[PDB]
Amino acid sequence: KNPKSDKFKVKRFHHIEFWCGDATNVARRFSWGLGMRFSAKSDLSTGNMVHASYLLTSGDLRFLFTAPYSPSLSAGEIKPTTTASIPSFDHGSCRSFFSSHGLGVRAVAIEVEDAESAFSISVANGAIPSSPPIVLNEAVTIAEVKLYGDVVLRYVSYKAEFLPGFERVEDASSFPLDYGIRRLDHAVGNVPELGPALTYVAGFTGFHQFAEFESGLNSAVLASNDEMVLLPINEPVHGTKRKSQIQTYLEHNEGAGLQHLALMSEDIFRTLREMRKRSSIGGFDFMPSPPPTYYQNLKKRVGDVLSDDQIKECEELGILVDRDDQGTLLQIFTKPLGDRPTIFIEIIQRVGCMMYQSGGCGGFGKGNFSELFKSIEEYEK
Amino acid sequence: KNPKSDKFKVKRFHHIEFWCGDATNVARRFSWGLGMRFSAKSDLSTGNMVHASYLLTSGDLRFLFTAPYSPSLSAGEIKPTTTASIPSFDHGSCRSFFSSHGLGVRAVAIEVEDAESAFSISVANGAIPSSPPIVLNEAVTIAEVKLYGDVVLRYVSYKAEFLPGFERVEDASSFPLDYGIRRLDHAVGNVPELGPALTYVAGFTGFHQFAEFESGLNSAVLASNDEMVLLPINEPVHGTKRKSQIQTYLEHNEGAGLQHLALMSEDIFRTLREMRKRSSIGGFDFMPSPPPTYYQNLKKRVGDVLSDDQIKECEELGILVDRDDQGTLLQIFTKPLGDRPTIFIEIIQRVGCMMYQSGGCGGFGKGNFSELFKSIEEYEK
Numbered sequence: 037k038n039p040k041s042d043k044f045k046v047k048r049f050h051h052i053e054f055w056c057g058d059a060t061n062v063a064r065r066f067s068w069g070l071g072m073r074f075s076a077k078s079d080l081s082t083g084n085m086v087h088a089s090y091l092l093t094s095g096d097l098r099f100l101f102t103a104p105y106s107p108s109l110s111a112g113e114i115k116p117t118t119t120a121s122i123p124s125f126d127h128g129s130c131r132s133f134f135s136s137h138g139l140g141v142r143a144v145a146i147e148v149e150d151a152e153s154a155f156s157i158s159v160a161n162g163a164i165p166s167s168p169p170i171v172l173n174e175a176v177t178i179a180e181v182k183l184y185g186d187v188v189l190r191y192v193s194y195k196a197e198f199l200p201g202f203e204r205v206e207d208a209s210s211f212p213l214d215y216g217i218r219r220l221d222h223a224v225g226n227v228p229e230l231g232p233a234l235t236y237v238a239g240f241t242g243f244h245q246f247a248e249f250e251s252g253l254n255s256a257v258l259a260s261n262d263e264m265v266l267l268p269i270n271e272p273v274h275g276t277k278r279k280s281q282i283q284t285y286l287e288h289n290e291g292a293g294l295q296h297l298a299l300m301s302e303d304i305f306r307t308l309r310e311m312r313k314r315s316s317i318g319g320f321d322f323m324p325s326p327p328p329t330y331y332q333n334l335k336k337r338v339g340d341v342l343s344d345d346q347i348k349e350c351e352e353l354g355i356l357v358d359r360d361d362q363g364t365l366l367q368i369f370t371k372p373l374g375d376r377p378t379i380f381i382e383i384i385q386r387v388g389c390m391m392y393q394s395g396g397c398g399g400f401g402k403g404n405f406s407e408l409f410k411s412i413e414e415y416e417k
Numbered sequence: 418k419n420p421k422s423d424k425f426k427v428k429r430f431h432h433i434e435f436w437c438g439d440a441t442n443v444a445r446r447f448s449w450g451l452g453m454r455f456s457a458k459s460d461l462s463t464g465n466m467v468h469a470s471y472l473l474t475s476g477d478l479r480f481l482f483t484a485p486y487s488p489s490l491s492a493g494e495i496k497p498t499t500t501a502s503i504p505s506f507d508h509g510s511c512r513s514f515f516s517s518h519g520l521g522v523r524a525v526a527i528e529v530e531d532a533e534s535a536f537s538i539s540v541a542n543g544a545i546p547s548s549p550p551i552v553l554n555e556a557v558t559i560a561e562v563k564l565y566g567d568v569v570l571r572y573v574s575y576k577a578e579f580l581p582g583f584e585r586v587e588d589a590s591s592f593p594l595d596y597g598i599r600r601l602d603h604a605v606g607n608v609p610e611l612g613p614a615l616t617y618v619a620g621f622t623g624f625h626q627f628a629e630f631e632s633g634l635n636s637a638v639l640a641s642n643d644e645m646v647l648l649p650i651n652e653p654v655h656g657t658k659r660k661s662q663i664q665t666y667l668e669h670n671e672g673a674g675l676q677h678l679a680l681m682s683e684d685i686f687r688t689l690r691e692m693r694k695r696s697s698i699g700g701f702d703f704m705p706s707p708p709p710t711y712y713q714n715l716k717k718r719v720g721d722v723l724s725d726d727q728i729k730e731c732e733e734l735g736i737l738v739d740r741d742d743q744g745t746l747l748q749i750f751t752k753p754l755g756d757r758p759t760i761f762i763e764i765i766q767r768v769g770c771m772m773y774q775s776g777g778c779g780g781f782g783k784g785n786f787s788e789l790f791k792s793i794e795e796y797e798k
């Protein structure tokens with residue numbers, strides 16, 4: 037059931053902004069590790085005396101990495117005279133965020149028809165304002181409201197390349213890496229209590245609950261009208277034998293925040309070969325692989341969608357497979373992206389639900405919990 | 418002239434510690450960019466609830482990258498009960514350093530015979546104490562005194578692998594990269610006034626002035642008895658046509674600090690080929706190459722030490738060459754390692770002064786200033 041109750045017109049995920057202490061090093065690590073090209077910059081070389089911001093792209097996926105310069109460089113400026121290319125940036129806010137959470141997502145940015153209207157309607161409907169609508173070079177409007185913890189939902193709209201004040205990077209310094217990643221599929225937040233977070237966010241967006249089908253979580257997925265913008269939220273399940281990873285997140289993150297980014301690949305086998313090649317030479321590590329009994333059981337579960345060659349190719353790369361009533365999902369998870377056991381990345385590919393492909397096709401892999409438990413028992417035997 | 422006036426017994430450079438906000442990402446970038454292997458860790462997985470520290474090694478070169486966890490993880494501990502593997506670490510100090518300077522060197526660590534005696538003698542002779550001598554697992558003693566700005570000189574001594582509490586890393590996650598870098602040759606600080614910084618540091622160490630032969634600096638090199646520990650210091654030359662890069666450093670760094678690390682390569686041609694291969698895929702960028710007139714002039718300057726093939730091979734990689742009265746120096750400089758125009762790395766190789774090779778052989782390349790100026794004029798013509 038899809039009531040299509042969006043309170044304003046939402047298009048797609050536009051970008052994800054990380055707040056760091058040094059944007060250069062994080063960005064270069066991510067670029068090599070995920071096969072994303074350097075495509076735009078806003079920094080000292082472009083006249084920005086406030087923050088350094090570097091954009092990585094792969095397909096439609098846009099990762100923005102931002103860090104503050106010394107406030108002394110811009111002590112003379114006022115908001116009307118600022119050289120910051122992202123007007124919502126605040127030195128104090130950024131340093132506070134990073135010292136409290138470490139490396140993490142500050143903004144989930146969705147493109148809308150009218151950022152000003154989206155902000156006004158949102159705030160009219162309970163959204164806590166974070167940064168008012170600002171019009172950039174009469175071309176782009178940006179606005180921000182609080183999402184959960186210190187994460188904001190950022191509205192972007194275009195009258196008619198990233199943002200004004202960003203320069204395209206010299207493609208001597210722009211190597212065309214690409215491991216097949218194409219777009220952001222979903223972005224997941226961890227909160228201490230799911231109910232009030234859902235009510236708040238659904239309240240100001242009109243996003244509806246996406247239909248789902250002893251893991252440590254309860255969760256729910258908010259979706260836009262066409263279900264291309266997907267914003268799941270988890271809370272911990274306490275009192276279990278094994279400690280909830282959601283709770284472990286909240287402890288090490290100092291509260292609520294974004295837990296994982298799921299990036300869609302057009303060829304998850306090529307992506308995972310390319311990423312695993314680089315795990316120990318600057319890239320990303322992956323979750324420990326499941327026991328081969330897991331692979332000795334998915335011919336009986338998806339043997340009509342994957343050949344015996346492809347299911348074995350899943351066993352090399354450590355891919356998990358799950359199935360809705362309408363589609364199939366291939367997925368794998370990185371180890372945490374930074375020092376703390378907080379944010380991580382998920383690579384996914386969806387098979388089915390062709391009309392274009394409809395969003396959420398195959399679900400989000402919650403079935404792999406009991407399947408991995410089951411498999412672990414059978415591998416012990 | 419070498420008076421050999423060391424007030425205590427100094428052996429060699431032991432390690433360089435960077436203070437960052439996320440040690441994982443900086444360390445992985447450096448590892449890939451410089452060809453350094455991951456060799457030890459101290460973090461949550463080893464019981465350290467205070468800081469994450471990751472050691473990279475290449476030959477004798479040791480880079481340590483450290484970042485703070487949330488203070489909440491160790492709120493119950495006291496210094497006697499600490500799980501920190503580096504007892505001098507302080508959450509507040511580290512966050513303050515990084516927000517003030519950004520990514521940068523916190524400690525220049527030299528190995529001594531007796532860290533306790535070196536600290537006592539140093540403080541007796543004017544050194545500002547930073548962290549008293551602490552004995553680690555009855556095996557290693559560490560002590561710290563202020564060097565300049567927020568940089569400390571760290572004394573390490575061993576009774577008889579990095580430090581207690583560090584674990585060797587699983588060499589599944591330890592890929593044996595190596596681009597030829599072998600040891601730290603010198604470590605250079607920028608200060609607003611050279612005189613008082615020299616007097617202070619020479620005052621408590623007994624290090625002597627290393628004999629040297631419109632650049633924006635005045636400098637001087639302090640050296641230990643065998644001149645293997647080399648600690649140059651610069652100050653800006655003001656009032657010039659072109660603004661002093663030392664002054665630009667002090668502005669963007671918020672004061673004094675370490676300016677560059679010079680790393681010795683056993684094959685600077687292989688190192689520079691390997692590093693330049695990776696510049697645009699996660700590694701380090703290099704200074705813009707000098708005009709070919711520079712290369713059309715060094716046959717007349719070092720044509721007796723480098724063949725015509727090797728001097729052309731210098732022209733590909735952008736290597737600079739300078740000459741003392743006793744040796745020859747090959748050198749090149751990276752662009753700054755992080756967001757700010759502050760710290761950078763120098764790769765060098767020295768040719769001559771064989772007895773082992775004596776330190777400082779060939780100098781530090783100050784002659785390349787007027788040679789580059791001259792060359793630039795001749796290339797205009």
Ligand SMILES: Cc1nn(C)c(O)c1C(=O)c1ccc2c(c1C)c(=O)n(-c1cncc(Cl)c1)c(=O)n2C
Pocket residue numbers: 222224255256257268269280281296298323369382400401402403404405408
């Ligand atoms: C759930 C969920 N709901 N929504 C809306 C999503 O997008 C998701 C997921 O992506 C998803 C799906 C299956 C997973 C995991 C995740 C994050 C996961 O994290 N782990 C896990 C790995 N290592 C240590 C621990 Cl404690 C747990 C698993 O085993 N499975 C099977």
Ligand SMILES: Cc1nn(C)c(O)c1C(=O)c1ccc2c(c1C)c(=O)n(-c1cncc(Cl)c1)c(=O)n2C
Pocket residue numbers: 603605636637638649650661662677679704750763781782783784785786789
């Ligand atoms: C000097 C010095 N003294 N001691 C003790 C040392 O170790 C050094 C050096 O290493 C050294 C030697 C030659 C250099 C440079 C450096 C750091 C340098 O930085 N630059 C430069 C590059 N790009 C922009 C600007 Cl403004 C300046 C140059 O041109 N030359 C020729």
Ligand SMILES: [Co+2]
Pocket residue numbers: 222224296298382400
């Ligand atoms: Co997911």
Ligand SMILES: [Co+2]
Pocket residue numbers: 603605677679763781
């Ligand atoms: Co030097």
